[PDB]
Amino acid sequence: SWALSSGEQWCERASPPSSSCLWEQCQLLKSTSVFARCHPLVDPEPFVALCEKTLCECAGGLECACPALLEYARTCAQEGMVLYGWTDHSACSPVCPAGMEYRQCVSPCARTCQSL
């Protein structure tokens, strides 16, 4: 209902793919202490369901869980406390252009080479 066609860019009703289906790694969303700290905040159950939906296909290897884990971590951080130390167990090491340093709570101030 919110599609916005534009000139040449017509479109049609997008419909769910008709494709059906053990990497149970993300079960730690409700087990590991690092994630457990967030349980008082947003519940993991929707994210565990999102796991199951992905895992059903999750075309690939040890990636079926990383998106959901990262999303849960970001949601918890936005909601309040930020999950420190996660990504050290099984996450996909969120991609970075170079100088691999994916770090929770990196100040945007980010003192750079040429700064006052």
Next chain:
Amino acid sequence: DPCALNPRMTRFSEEACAVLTSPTFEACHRAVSPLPYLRNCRYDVCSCSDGRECLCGALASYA
């Protein structure tokens, strides 16, 4: 201004419902002023499901 709710369609709406003012219709301009029809075409193209079909409808209405 339905086109505000769909900003992506502004370019097409402006550049499409302009043949009404183009020389192709200068023969009719004197017969009928395409002010209401241009406004209707712009309101249609940028407000309906299929932009090109509504452009057809409006331009054909003026014709």
